[PDB]
RNA sequence: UAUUGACGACCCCGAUUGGUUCUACUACAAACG
């Protein structure tokens, strides 16, 4: 098939790690309002992840120390611009159908997520 | 469908009262037989 995207490229985040995700936006896509609970939950998630290895991060440490062969994951090591969810920032989402309605529980930054 | 695979310390003082109350001129020598 041919398909166009985007590549939501981390990094080596695990040492089983092959392969990033391009997102195939050629084909079917869903449109749902962003509230600002989401906007406030991937803040304090993304603070959280960015917090939690600082001292790690600061003294150099090239991956987290209880994974090896592996680096930071994107979010820890970005600004802080990637701690607001600005216009085009790529994430997955965590949803479900109910009522006949694709809800949509949170934004996160990796498959198997914190 | 649930796998990958082990490492790692943290806390270092925090909160509060920081002036309160009384004495603030008193007798005199000059006035007044």
């Not at 098939?1 to 990033?20: A, C, L, P, R, S």
């Not at 600002?36 to 150099?60: A, M």
């Not at 701690?83 to 159908?97: E, M, P, Q």
């Amino acid at each position: 098939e041919q398909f166009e995207g985007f590549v939501y490229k981390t990094n080596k985040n695990i040492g089983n790690k092959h392969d990033e995700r391009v997102f195939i936006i050629d084909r079917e896509s869903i449109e749902i309002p962003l509230s600002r609970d989401l906007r406030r939950k991937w803040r304090e998630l993304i603070t959280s992840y960015q917090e939690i290895h600082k001292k790690e991060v600061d003294r150099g440490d090239t991956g987290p120390s209880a994974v090896n062969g592996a680096v930071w994951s994107r979010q820890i090591i970005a600004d802080e611009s990637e701690r607001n969810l600005s216009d085009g920032t790529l994430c997955y989402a965590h949803v479900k159908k109910e009522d006949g309605q694709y809800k949509i529980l949170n934004l996160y930054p990796v498959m198997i997520t914190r």
